[PDB]
Amino acid sequence: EKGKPLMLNPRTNKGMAFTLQERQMLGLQGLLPPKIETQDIQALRFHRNLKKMTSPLEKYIYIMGIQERNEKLFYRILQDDIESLMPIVYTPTVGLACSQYGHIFRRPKGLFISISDRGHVRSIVDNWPENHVKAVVVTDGERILGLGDLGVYGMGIPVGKLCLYTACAGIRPDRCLPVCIDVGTDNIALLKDPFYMGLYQKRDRTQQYDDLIDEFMKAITDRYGRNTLIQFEDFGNHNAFRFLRKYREKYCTFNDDIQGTAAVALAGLLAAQKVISKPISEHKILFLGAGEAALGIANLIVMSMVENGLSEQEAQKKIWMFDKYGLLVKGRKAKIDSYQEPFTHSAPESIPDTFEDAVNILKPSTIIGVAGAGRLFTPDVIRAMASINERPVIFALSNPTAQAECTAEEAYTLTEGRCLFASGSPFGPVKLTDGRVFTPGQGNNVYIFPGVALAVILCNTRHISDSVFLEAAKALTSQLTDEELAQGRLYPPLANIQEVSINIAIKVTEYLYANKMAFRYPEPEDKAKYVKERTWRSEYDSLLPDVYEWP
Amino acid sequence: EKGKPLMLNPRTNKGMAFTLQERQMLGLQGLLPPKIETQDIQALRFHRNLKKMTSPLEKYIYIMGIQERNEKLFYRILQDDIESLMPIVYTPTVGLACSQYGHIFRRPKGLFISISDRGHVRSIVDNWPENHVKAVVVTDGERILGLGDLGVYGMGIPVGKLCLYTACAGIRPDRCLPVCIDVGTDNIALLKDPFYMGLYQKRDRTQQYDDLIDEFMKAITDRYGRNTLIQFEDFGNHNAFRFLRKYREKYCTFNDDIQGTAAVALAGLLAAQKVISKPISEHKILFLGAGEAALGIANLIVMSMVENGLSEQEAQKKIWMFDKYGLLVKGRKAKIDSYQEPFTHSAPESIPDTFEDAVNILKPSTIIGVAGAGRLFTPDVIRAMASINERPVIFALSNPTAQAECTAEEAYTLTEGRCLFASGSPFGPVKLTDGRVFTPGQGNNVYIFPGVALAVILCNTRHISDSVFLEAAKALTSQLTDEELAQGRLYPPLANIQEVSINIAIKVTEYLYANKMAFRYPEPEDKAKYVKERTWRSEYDSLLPDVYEWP
Amino acid sequence: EKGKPLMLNPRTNKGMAFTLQERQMLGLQGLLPPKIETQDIQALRFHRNLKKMTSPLEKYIYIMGIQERNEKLFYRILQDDIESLMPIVYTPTVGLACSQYGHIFRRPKGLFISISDRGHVRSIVDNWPENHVKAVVVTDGERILGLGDLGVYGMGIPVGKLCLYTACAGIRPDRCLPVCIDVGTDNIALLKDPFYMGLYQKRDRTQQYDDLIDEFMKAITDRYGRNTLIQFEDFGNHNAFRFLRKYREKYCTFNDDIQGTAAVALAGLLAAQKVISKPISEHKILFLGAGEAALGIANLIVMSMVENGLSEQEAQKKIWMFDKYGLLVKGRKAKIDSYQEPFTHSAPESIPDTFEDAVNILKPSTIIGVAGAGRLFTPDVIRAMASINERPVIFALSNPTAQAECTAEEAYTLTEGRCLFASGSPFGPVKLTDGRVFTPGQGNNVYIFPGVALAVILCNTRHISDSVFLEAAKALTSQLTDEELAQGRLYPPLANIQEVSINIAIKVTEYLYANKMAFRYPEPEDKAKYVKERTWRSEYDSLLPDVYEWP
Ligand SMILES: NC(=O)c1ccc[n+]([C@@H]2O[C@H](COP(=O)([O-])OP(=O)(O)OC[C@H]3O[C@@H](n4cnc5c(N)ncnc54)[C@H](O)[C@@H]3O)[C@@H](O)[C@H]2O)c1
Ligand SMILES: NC(=O)c1ccc[n+]([C@@H]2O[C@H](COP(=O)([O-])OP(=O)(O)OC[C@H]3O[C@@H](n4cnc5c(N)ncnc54)[C@H](O)[C@@H]3O)[C@@H](O)[C@H]2O)c1
Ligand SMILES: NC(=O)c1ccc[n+]([C@@H]2O[C@H](COP(=O)([O-])OP(=O)(O)OC[C@H]3O[C@@H](n4cnc5c(N)ncnc54)[C@H](O)[C@@H]3O)[C@@H](O)[C@H]2O)c1
Ligand SMILES: NC(=O)c1ccc[n+]([C@@H]2O[C@H](COP(=O)([O-])OP(=O)(O)OC[C@H]3O[C@@H](n4cnc5c(N)ncnc54)[C@H](O)[C@@H]3O)[C@@H](O)[C@H]2O)c1
Ligand SMILES: NC(=O)c1ccc[n+]([C@@H]2O[C@H](COP(=O)([O-])OP(=O)(O)OC[C@H]3O[C@@H](n4cnc5c(N)ncnc54)[C@H](O)[C@@H]3O)[C@@H](O)[C@H]2O)c1
Ligand SMILES: NC(=O)c1ccc[n+]([C@@H]2O[C@H](COP(=O)([O-])OP(=O)(O)OC[C@H]3O[C@@H](n4cnc5c(N)ncnc54)[C@H](O)[C@@H]3O)[C@@H](O)[C@H]2O)c1
Ligand SMILES: O=C(O)c1cc(Cc2ccc(O)c(C(=O)O)c2)ccc1O
Ligand SMILES: O=C(O)c1cc(Cc2ccc(O)c(C(=O)O)c2)ccc1O
Ligand SMILES: O=C(O)c1cc(Cc2ccc(O)c(C(=O)O)c2)ccc1O
């Protein structure tokens, strides 16, 4: 590359970080303003401009423009101030941007695969320029978090997600590929407007869609190898669950909604058992719902109990999921699926028909809001649990705040501060009237998915087992220091997520080599140095050709 | 070109206007959303988005983003709604954008030539990709209209100007080259901030700057030929005037501030003499100032009088410029330069020291606000002139409105509507209490410079004489219809400027061939068809390779 | 790629195999003659042209021109008729071409690394376009086979060699890299002429040369990985031997002169023991020389004896190398190096000072001409051995024919046809007066090095052990059929070398996985299908973009 295409390419574009000698040798002289700036000046300038803006959507437009222009400076900006720019880059600002502005990308991002393109997906994959990609994020747009069906406009969900992949873990930006598979949109408003950008049919739910998914995965693994990591982001619950079950064995697929959330919740529980004297195996758990997400969380919990030596049956006896119809129990009138069969225990005497009565009779030590039907955790049940348990553990995993089962402020104020609270939604620190301000921990998947993805990429793992996420949860819990536990935090601070992700990767990497699930050989003697070398560094590299004189 | 670089190039980028067969043959399949859109849908979408925005600066950012992304659609948007988007694209929104946001261009535009690059300007010119350029706009940034010195941030002034070159005249976008020559900035604020993007020295006024201008013009004419049209935009008054005088003979240079404004004012005067019974040669003129701009206007006026057969001396006797010190008169104590010597007439008896008394004694038929010292046209002098003349002609050429000598509303209301008013600043229609709403004509250079530039480009003219602008003014006046003259308008509507510009070009082209100043041979038999063929059309052209089967 | 660069690139160039639709879609229409030809017509045409030529050097020029023009057709031509074109492409015609015509390549081939470029070898390696290379052949030019020192003109030796890598094994042409390291030339004639193309200094033998080799290997392994296969071709005996010893452990290096020749000779010996009733371990061996080449051959022989269960000491007792001074024996006046110490046996009673007397007393069953001092195998010693042994085994590994120790015709005629003869030099079939025409087997490294290289490339082997070549020799011997052994052939025919090489690779691959020396995981269940899939196929692949119509 030379001349103008050097700046036009975001991978190699330096803005004004092009030194004078670089400008003169590479033919960039005269096409740039006379000033020469280090990357620090560039980042400071864009941080000032970002501080000027006041709305998260405007910040999103600005930061994505920076990404389309210069990627290395964009990632330095993102890594430099990551706690404040993470909501802008991934969630929930991406949903709002996709809904209101639709498609904003002034540059080709990822691939658009349609059901009209069935039978020829391999050519579409061949059209993608990058020869080696390691991570692929696939979206259907059917279930955008909090916005329902956006159709083809959900392509911002993978791209933003991939930014985190590079901002936290260190995966190279050119090894990532965001893919949007659109089979139509289900909402009327998108079907009606003339400026919708995609198929105008209603969403296709026939065998054609399943065959399209099969063909796409086969084509991507044919071009990029069997060990390419493919992640299904924001599919429908039915589609995502079924596709994870179908492709988990064949391909290197892990789903963040099902598996990452279980890892984050289990990490919170391990932090709680580090704070509370009693262990996890001693105390029983009550779930708000019983679905494959809830079954995944309970499976991680029972695995964590088993690894400590306690028997699988005794560990399963602890969890008592509660369905929509009622408490999950043997002989119940309501149907019981095979997956939720293991947590089907003996009948309680009352057989309560309400959740509050269920807490009253069962007297659980931990409560988990996995059902997400809405604002289910009433103050009455919270007070009942606080009476039952000395230090109750309350989890409200659903987001946003309105959809959450409980509010951190109410949960902390209603009790005397004894409860341990962790929620998916972000909440500000809560200060009681007497004092003792409490900061509710926030558990989001950004803790887990980047580090696990980096470890799987580096280890050339072909099958992502369910125990990998247990190891990741243990690593995430071990990240916490003693003083953080004393403060009452259950998760490491998001201000220094990058190192956390790196550490997580290390642990997973060691596990992947201990259990013969990693196919990158020779096995490194030290995993930490190997992963720290493999990571991407967002620092400009000189393009000056080496000039010397022969003797 | 094939694949991704086809979209990355704004010249060849089509957005979703890429037909399905084009996407499949050229390898764009899968990189675009599934929808295929004609250019009309694209323009409608962007017009709706533009209507959503409410501030002219936001509109400027949006439209320039469109230009950086897809140029043909940008020019269709600009030509489609040109009256409302012309203030956004060129003036005064470009000044505000350059002042507040500095440099916003996410793509290389034009060239940046600095005084530190002296001695090597030819290499900088060689760095520019386009092999053939016909028009060059050079800015120094010293005098941005209404904003003083912006230093290197004035580069938005050429680029926006060049948009008009393509939006009105039809000059090809790739034949244009915006050049910013920065020799430092004079204002302290730009020198002080760390994020200024250019030289941190104070503006250089020595022989080095003149030699840099000489070298730049020599280098540009060496690479692109002697007939390359070079225009000095927004230099300092001293620098622009001196450089026009120096390079007018050697190179194909015309300055819009000096020569285009004279053409527009003379066109307004010709429209006035079409409205008013009396001819131009019969009535005398009084100027608010006497400078090379005022001398250029008066020179155009005397040329127009001469071409009608009236002697040069008699024509010169009519104009009576008024200096800052006082009325320009022979034997005056104040200095008289050689250029303003011809309009130095016999002493009036009063020798008035104030402008109002000057109007009272001289009793001019026409008044022209070329001095622009500020709000000089008092209501008293306006009433005095309206008493003197049955239908006074009042010109307030200075802009913005605050800097204008008079307000169109006040000028029309104060008189009974008899006056003919034309101003550089845009004014809304003025409706009197009794009735008879009057729309003051607005005279801006966008009438003249695009068509003249197109004619000069097509005719391969090496020297732009001063009579070319007289011919252009006559053409612009002839554009007006009888009903428009009856309404009181002095200029053609800006809604249909494009055709106006085309017509202007035709006339100039004919003149350039009648006076042996055009070097494009063979001379076309009909100039209209020649120019209408040569113009650029902002319509997508199919990239499909021709596929046929041999017999 | 599109248009003219598609033909200019030999990798993607098809000549007239471009179908009409390919020409029309890819923009090649009109740049090619109207005819459309399959690859068969192209190969037939070039075979006819090749038959017209009469001198091997002219054939070499023609075939290398074809390679520079279209590589896939060149490799189809080479594979189609490989027995006759192998002498043209690699040996000995490459030496003659390099000597007489110097550098003939009209296209950049490989890299030229000079000692003046020391300290900056990494930049030179970075200049090479191909991102992934698997095989590297490095030449110094000091010892070209039969032509001494050619300096920088020896670059034809790697390139031609790499052709075999693709013609026999199936290694992709773009994964190969020929490198010529020139530290000067030692011969006066090249130093004297003005048109020599390289350094005009005498060959550098100081520490600078060793440091240059170290730096080059480090730079190549840094860019292309630790498992890149690097082969030292035609270095000096001292330099090649020392560099193999030094870099065998660190890098994936195998030397054909030392290790491949041992494998070929051992394969001949195994074919002999399949023809002769007695086993290898039963009969003793006498060598003409004792050097690291002879020690390598004897090491392969003792390994082959050991793998059959016979003890290492007993196996070593069999080989009796004969030095230049005299028979290698304990207590000898002449110096004995550490490497040749194991084959230092008890003193014979005569202690013969001549080779004929050595054969007379020792009465060896096998004789091997590894010394290559010249025409050493006198008819007297041949008759003596034929009297000693019922079916003597005579090996003349040195080439060319004049340098050979014996002539196949003389060896076969002098005995009654009982002897088994294998020589490096090619010899025509020898027909005795009574009858029974005998075809002497020819043992050249082209049997071994391509298949071993392919197996090492596919298995990602980091260290090439000495037992790999023993396994390769066993595979090569097992290639022979029973009827071929009955005919008296010791090596498979060269007409079908490709499949032979493939089979060799398979065996080596299995060995590399059986001994945990292969780092490509997951380990394939069947090695044969894996290697047969991985090989390069010299068949044109359609460049037509997939064109379909959406429903
Ligand atoms: N200027 C460049 O862009 C540049 C320079 C050097 C190397 N590379 C890349 O290094 C690769 C060589 O692989 P290796 O020797 O490191 O294998 P490795 O053994 O070190 O790693 C094993 C796997 O992990 C992948 N991987 C390693 N680091 C990664 C990262 N930061 N992000 C995402 N994936 C990562 C690798 O692609 C590889 O497949 C080349 O394919 C090449 O693409 C690129
Ligand atoms: N990306 C994330 O942050 C993430 C991840 C996992 C789960 N979740 C949460 O899980 C929920 C959806 O996941 P899912 O797999 O469980 O859905 P699902 O369709 O598989 O099943 C929902 C379960 O909730 C139970 N339930 C529903 N309403 C109930 C009610 N009013 N009272 C008692 N039980 C009720 C149902 O019995 C059912 O078993 C959402 O709230 C979602 O916020 C979020
Ligand atoms: N796909 C394309 O981009 C394309 C196709 C055809 C021709 N062209 C251009 O046409 C030019 C051939 O010149 P010609 O035969 O028309 O000479 P001409 O006699 O018709 O015109 C005389 C001069 O006017 C210039 N000119 C003509 N039209 C112009 C326009 N719309 N905008 C700006 N300048 C214009 C020309 O460059 C020429 O120098 C080529 O240099 C080539 O750059 C471009
Ligand atoms: N781009 C445009 O629209 C354009 C073009 C031409 C001229 N102008 C107007 O011309 C003016 C500057 O051009 P210029 O070449 O004449 O400047 P200049 O420096 O060459 O001379 C200014 C003239 O104005 C006279 N003058 C100044 N103040 C006066 C006062 N209070 N009373 C009477 N006379 C006074 C002076 O005698 C002097 O001759 C600006 O108002 C500018 O708006 C604008
Ligand atoms: N159109 C093309 O040029 C094209 C198409 C597909 C794949 N490829 C190549 O396939 C490679 C993917 O490697 P893989 O999935 O086959 O790994 P693999 O597990 O099948 O093989 C292991 C190693 O052997 C190498 N190798 C395989 N076949 C080879 C051959 N015929 N010649 C020389 N070396 C060979 C590979 O580079 C790899 O490093 C890509 O790097 C890419 O360069 C090229
Ligand atoms: N590329 C090939 O085909 C290939 C491969 C290996 C060996 N060779 C042959 O080996 C020879 C060189 O290899 P090297 O490593 O053995 O050289 P070397 O320098 O390492 O040693 C040569 C050996 O030959 C012995 N010798 C020399 N002259 C002798 C004589 N007149 N009588 C008895 N013994 C004598 C010497 O004692 C010495 O040990 C060449 O003939 C060469 O053709 C060829
Ligand atoms: O490399 C650099 O630092 C660099 C920075 C800028 C400033 C800029 C960029 C994007 C924007 O959206 C806005 C804005 O709109 O304020 C401003 C321009 C050119 C550059 O080369
Ligand atoms: O070609 C097209 O029509 C096309 C249009 C869009 C929409 C768009 C572009 C720029 C914007 O700034 C905004 C916004 O910010 O609202 C939106 C995106 C991709 C396309 O390919
Ligand atoms: O692709 C093809 O078949 C093809 C073949 C030829 C013939 C040819 C090539 C090389 C030569 O050296 C000689 C000669 O010298 O006789 C002749 C020319 C153009 C082609 O496109």
Which amino acid belongs to residue B92?
P
- Residue A135 CA from chain centroid, whole number: 14
Q: Whose CA is nearest to atom 28 of ligand 1?
A: A534
- Distance between B148 CA and the closest CA of chain C, angstroms: 50
From the list A33, A44, A124, which residue is nearest B30 (CB)?
A124
Please indicate whether, in this complex, the C-beta atoms of B27 and C550 are within 8 angstroms of each other: no
Give the ligand with the smallest distance to the CA of C64: 9
Structure tokens at C149: 């020192």
- Which amino acid belongs to residue B173? P
Question: How close C17 gets to chain B, by Cα (Å)?
Answer: 16
**What is the three-state SS of B339-387?**
CCCCCCECCCCCCCCCHHHHHHHHCCCEEEECCCCCCCCCHHHHHHHHH
Q: Which residues of C touch A517 (CB under 8 A)?
A: none
CB pair distance less than 8 Å for B125 and A195 = no
Question: Using CB atoms, which chains have 3+ pairs under 8 A with C?
Answer: A, B
Q: Report in angstroms the alpha-carbon separations of A415 from A407, A410, A412, A432.
A: 13, 8, 6, 10
Contact A125 B30 (CB under 8 A): yes
Those residues with Cβ within 8 angstroms of residue A21's Cβ, 6 or more apart along the chain or in another chain: A544
Q: Which of A90, A224, A447, A540 is flagged as catalytic?
A: A90
Interatomic CA distance for residues B316 and A499, integer angstroms: 82
Q: Which of B106, B109, B180, B193 to mutate to test the pocket of ligand 7 (most atoms within 8 A of CB)?
A: B106
Name chain B contacts of C26, Cβ cutoff 8 Å. 545
Structure tokens at C521: 């995981």
Q: Looking at the partner chain, which of B24, B34, B547 has a beta carbon nearest the beta carbon of C21?
A: B547
Phi, psi values for residue C466, rounded to 5°: -80, -20
* Nearest-neighbour CA in chain C from B17: distance (Å): 16
In ligand 7, the atom with minimum distance to the C-alpha of A70 is 1
Where are the alpha helices (H) located in A13-92, listed in sequence order?
20-25, 39-52, 56-69, 71-80, 82-89
Distance between CA atoms of residues A8 and C327, nearest Å = 73
Closest CA to A422 of A377, A489, A375, A484: A489
Q: What are the tokens at C522? A: 């997951």
Structure tokens at A480: 């916490």
Of C20, C24, C550, the CB nearest to B545: C24
Residue in A255, A287, A370 to alter for ligand 2 test, most ligand atoms within 8 A of Cβ: A370
Active site residue A101: no
Query: What is the residue whose two structure tokens read 């009982």?
Result: C418
Contacts B550 to C, Cβ<8 Å: 20, 34
Query: Nearest C-alpha of chain B: how many angstroms from C122?
Result: 29
CA distances to A91, A491, A516, A525 from A500, rounded to whole Å, are 20, 11, 25, 22
Long-range contacts of A202-206 (CB under 8 A, 24+ apart): A203/A142, A203/A149, A203/A151, A204/A115
Cβ neighbour number for residue C523 with a 10 Å cutoff: 14
The label of the residue with tokens 């936001």 reads B58
Distance CA B103, CA B107 (A): 11
Probe target for ligand 7 pocket from A28, A45, A51, A70, with the most ligand atoms within 8 Å of CB: A45
- Torsion region of A533: left, alpha or beta (phi above 0 gives left; psi -120 to 50 gives alpha): alpha
The type of residue at A105 is F
Enumerate chain B positions whose Cβ falls within 8 A of a Cβ in C.
1-2, 20-21, 24-27, 29, 34, 545-550
Cα distance between residue B45 and residue C249, in whole Å: 66
Q: Do B20 and C546 touch (CB under 8 A)?
A: no
Strand partners, A126: none
Long-range CB contacts for residues B46-54, cutoff 8 Å, separation at least 24: B46/B73, B46/B77, B47/B77, B47/B80, B47/B81, B48/A195, B50/B77, B50/B85
CA distance, residue B549 to nearest chain C CA (Å): 8
**B3·A127 Cβ contact <8 A:** yes
Nearest CA in chain C to B25: C545
Q: Find tokens 């059309």 and name the residue.
A: B537
Nearest CA of chain C to the CA of B26: how many Å?
8
The DSSP code sequence of A427-471 is ---B--SSS--B--EE--GGGTHHHHHHHHHHHT-SS--SHHHHH
Q: What angle do CA B234, B236, B242 make, to 5 degrees?
A: 110
Sequence letter at residue A403: Q
Task: Tell me, using a 6 A CB cutoff, whether residue C392 lines ligand 9.
Answer: no
Ligand 5 mean position, distance from CA B2 (Å): 26
Three-class SS state of A53: coil
What is the C-alpha separation between C260 and C445, in angstroms, rounded?
6
Please answer whether residues A293 and A261 qualify as being in contact, where contact means their C-beta atoms are separated by less than 8 angstroms: yes
| Residue A150 DSSP one-character state | -
DSSP H helices in C389-517? 408-414, 449-459, 467-478, 482-487, 497-514
Are B29 and B45 in contact by the 8 Å Cβ rule? The answer is no
C5 chain-B contacts, CB cut-off 8 A: none
Rounded to a whole number, what is the distance in angstroms from the first to the last CA of chain B? 30
Take residue A271 and report the two structure tokens written for it. 């932090």
Q: How many CB atoms lie within 10 A of CB A232?
A: 25
Residue list, ligand 4 pocket, CB within 6 Å: B 237, 257, 261, 288-294, 322-324, 370-373, 376, 397-398, 424
Q: Alpha-carbon distance A452 to A470, whole Å?
A: 11
Q: Is there a contact between A521 and C521 if contact means CB atoms under 8 Å apart?
A: yes
Residues 6+ apart with CB under 8 A from C442: C422, C423, C424, C425, C426, C427, C491, C494
Nearest CA in chain C to B21: C547
* H/E segment holding residue C113: strand C111-114
* CB neighbour class for C47 (10 Å; exposed up to 12, middle 13-18, buried from 19): middle
8-state DSSP, A148:
B
- Cα A41 to chain center, whole Å? 32
Amino acid letter at B254?
F
Resolution value, angstrom units: 2.8
- Which residues neighbour B140 within 8 Å (Cβ) at sequence distance 6 or greater? B154, B180, B181, B182, B183, B232, B234, B235, B236, B239
Nearest chain C residue to A522 by CA: give it.
C519
Shortest-distance atom of ligand 4 to CA B145: 1
Interchain contact, A116 vs C551, CB within 8 Å: yes
Joined together, the tokens standing for residue A239 give 């589609």
The Å distance, Cα A52 to ligand 7 centre, comes to: 14
* Chains interfacing with B (3 or more CB pairs < 8 Å): A, C
Tokens of A116: 């009209």
Among protein residues, the one whose CA lies closest to atom 1 of ligand 5: C541
Q: Look at C462 and A519 and tell me if their CB atoms are within 8 Å.
A: no
Q: Which residues of A are annotated as a binding site for (S)-malate?
A: 143, 399, 444
Cα B457 to averaged position of ligand 3 atoms, centre (Å): 10
Residue of A14, A109, A134, A161 marked catalytic: A161
CB contact under 8 A, C20 and B549: yes
**Looking at the annotation, which residues of C are catalytic?**
90, 161
C-alpha of residue C289 to centroid of ligand 6, in Å: 6
Three-class SS of B97-129: HHHHHCCCCCCCCCEEEEHHHCCCHHHHHHCCC
B379-388 vs B355-362: helix axis angle to the nearest 10? Answer: 0
Tell me the C-alpha distance between B39 and A228, whole Å.
39
CA distances (Å), B37 to each of A195, B16, B31, B71, in order? 9, 5, 15, 16
Ligand 1, atom 26, residue with closest C-alpha: A458
Please say whether the beta carbons of C180 and C161 come within 8 A. Answer: no
